[PDB]
Amino acid sequence: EQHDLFSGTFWQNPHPAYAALRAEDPVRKLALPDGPVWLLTRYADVREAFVDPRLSKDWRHTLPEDQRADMPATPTPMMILMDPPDHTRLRKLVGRSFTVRRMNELEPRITEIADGLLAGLPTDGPVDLMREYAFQIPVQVICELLGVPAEDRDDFSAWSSVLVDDSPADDKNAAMGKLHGYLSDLLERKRTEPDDALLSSLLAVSDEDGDRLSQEELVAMAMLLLIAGHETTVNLIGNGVLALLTHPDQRKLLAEDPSLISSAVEEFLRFDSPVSQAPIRFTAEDVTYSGVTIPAGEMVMLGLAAANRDADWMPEPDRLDITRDASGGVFFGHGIHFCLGAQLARLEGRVAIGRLFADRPELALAVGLDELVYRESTLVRGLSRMPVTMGPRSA
Numbered sequence: 001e002q003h004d005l006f007s008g009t010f011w012q013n014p015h016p017a018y019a020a021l022r023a024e025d026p027v028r029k030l031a032l033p034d035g036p037v038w039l040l041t042r043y044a045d046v047r048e049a050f051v052d053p054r055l056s057k058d059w060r061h062t063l064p065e066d067q068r069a070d071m072p073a074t075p076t077p078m079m080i081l082m083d084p085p086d087h088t089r090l091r092k093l094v095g096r097s098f099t100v101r102r103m104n105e106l107e108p109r110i111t112e113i114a115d116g117l118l119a120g121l122p123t124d125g126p127v128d129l130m131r132e133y134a135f136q137i138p139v140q141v142i143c144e145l146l147g148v149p150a151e152d153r154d155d156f157s158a159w160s161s162v163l164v165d166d167s168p169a170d171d172k173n174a175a176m177g178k179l180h181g182y183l184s185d186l187l188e189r190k191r192t193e194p195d196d197a198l199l200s201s202l203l204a205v206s207d208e209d210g211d212r213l214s215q216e217e218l219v220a221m222a223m224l225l226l227i228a229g230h231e232t233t234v235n236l237i238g239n240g241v242l243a244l245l246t247h248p249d250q251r252k253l254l255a256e257d258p259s260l261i262s263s264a265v266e267e268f269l270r271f272d273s274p275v276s277q278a279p280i281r282f283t284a285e286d287v288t289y290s291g292v293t294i295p296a297g298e299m300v301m302l303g304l305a306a307a308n309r310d311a312d313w314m315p316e317p318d319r320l321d322i323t324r325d326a327s328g329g330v331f332f333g334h335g336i337h338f339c340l341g342a343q344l345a346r347l348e349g350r351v352a353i354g355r356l357f358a359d360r361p362e363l364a365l366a367v368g369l370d371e372l373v374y375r376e377s378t379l380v381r382g383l384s385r386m387p388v389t390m391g392p393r394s395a
C-alpha cells in the first residue's frame with residue numbers, strides 16, 4: 001500500500017518507503033513544499049547519476065536558453081555548487097590542505113573534546129544525547145580544524161547552531177553575515193600570524209602559475225566546511241549510537257572487540273545514511289533512468305539512504321552487520337564532489353561513538369523507538385533529540 005513520502009510516517013522510519021520506491025517507483029517526482037524534485041532510489045542509478053555529465057550543479061539549467069545572459073554561476077562561490085572546470089580548480093586548491101597528517105593531528109583534539117563532554121554527563125538523567133553530545137562535537141572539531149581562537153568558540157558555536165535551525169530563517173540569513181565577517185577578519189589574523197591550522201594553510205595555497213584562493217573564495221570555502229561538516233557529522237553520531245542501542249548483538253560484538261569501530265562506522269553510514277539524499281542536481285538535458293525520463297531543467301535528488309540498502313548491491317541490506325564490508329556505499333557521494341571531509345567525518349564518528357560506548361557501557365534509550373522524533377528536513381536523517389540514561393562510567 002502507499003507509504004507516506006517526506007510526510008507522515010516517513011520521518012520516523014523512511015526505510016520501508018525507500019524499499020517500495022526501489023521496487024515499484026525508482027524514479028519518482030516528489031511534490032515537496034518549495035517545489036517538485038525527482039528522486040532516484042536504486043543503487044545502480046544513483047551511482048550512474050553521480051557521474052552523469054548531464055546532471056549539473058549549475059542552477060541556470062532551470063532557465064530556458066533565452067533567459068541565461070545575466071546569470072551568475074553560483075549565489076556564493078561554493079565549490080559544491082559548481083561544475084568543472086571551475087569546480088576542478090577549487091577542489092585542487094582546497095584539497096592540498098586536507099592532508100593525512102592534518103587529520104591524524106586532529107585525533108587527540110577530537111578525543112579531548114569528546115572526553116570533556118562525557119565527563120560532564122550524569123549517570124541517571126535522562127539526558128538528550130543530541131543536544132548534550134552529538135550537537136557539540138562537530139562544531140568544536142571545525143573550530144579546531146580551522147584555528148578559531150578558543151575565546152571565539154562559544155560565540156562561533158552559538159551562531160553555528162542558528163544555521164542549524166533554532167528559530168526562523170530570517171536569523172540564519174544574518175548569522176551568515178556574522179560568520180562571514182568573523183571569518184573574513186580571522187583570515188587577516190592568520191595572514192599576519194601563520195599557524196598550523198586550516199585557514200592559515202588555505203592562504204598559502206598557490207599552484208605553479210601562482211594561482212590561489214581569492215579573499216571571497218577563502219571565506220566561501222570556510223563557510224562551506226562549517227555547513228557541510230556540522231549537521232552531517234552530528235547525525236552520523238546520533239544515527240550510529242541509535243543503531244547500537246537498537247541492536248544488542250552488534251553492540252556486544254563491538255564491546256568484545258573495540259577495534260571493530262572503524263568497520264562499525266562504515267556500516268552505520270550505510271544502514272542509516274545521515275545525508276539521506278544528495279543535494280540537488282539539475283538536468284542539463286533529458287535523462288532516462290530505469291526507463292523513466294526526467295525532462296531538461298528539472299531538479300534531481302539522489303537517494304543515498306535508499307541506495308545504501310539496495311539488495312541488488314548489498315545482500316541482507318536491512319541487517320546491521322558491523323563486520324560487513326563497507327565497499328561502494330554512496331553515503332559520502334561518488335565522483336568529483338565526493339565528500340572532502342570523509343576522513344575527518346570517519347575520525348569524528350569513531351572517536352565520538354567509540355569513546356561513548358567505552359565510557360558508558362550501560363547506555364540505554366530512555367524512550368521507545370516509536371517515540372523518537374526526527375527532523376523534517378528533506379536531505380537529512382537526523383534525530384531532533386535522543387532521550388537516554390547514560391548509566392555508570394566504566395570501571
Ligand code: HEM
Pocket residue numbers: 079080081091224225228229230232233234236274275278279280330331332333334336337338339340341342344345
Ligand atoms: C559527517 C558525515 C558527512 C557526510 C555523510 C557527508 C556527505 C557528503 C556528500 C554525500 C557529499 C557530496 C554531495 C553531492 O555530490 O551532491 C559531500 C560533499 C562535501 N562534503 Fe561532506 N559529509 C560529511 C561530513 C563532512 C565534513 C566533516 C566536512 C568538512 C570538514 C565535509 C565537507 C564537504 C565538502 C567541502 C563537500 C563538497 C565537495 C565538492 O563539491 O567537491 N563533509 N559530503
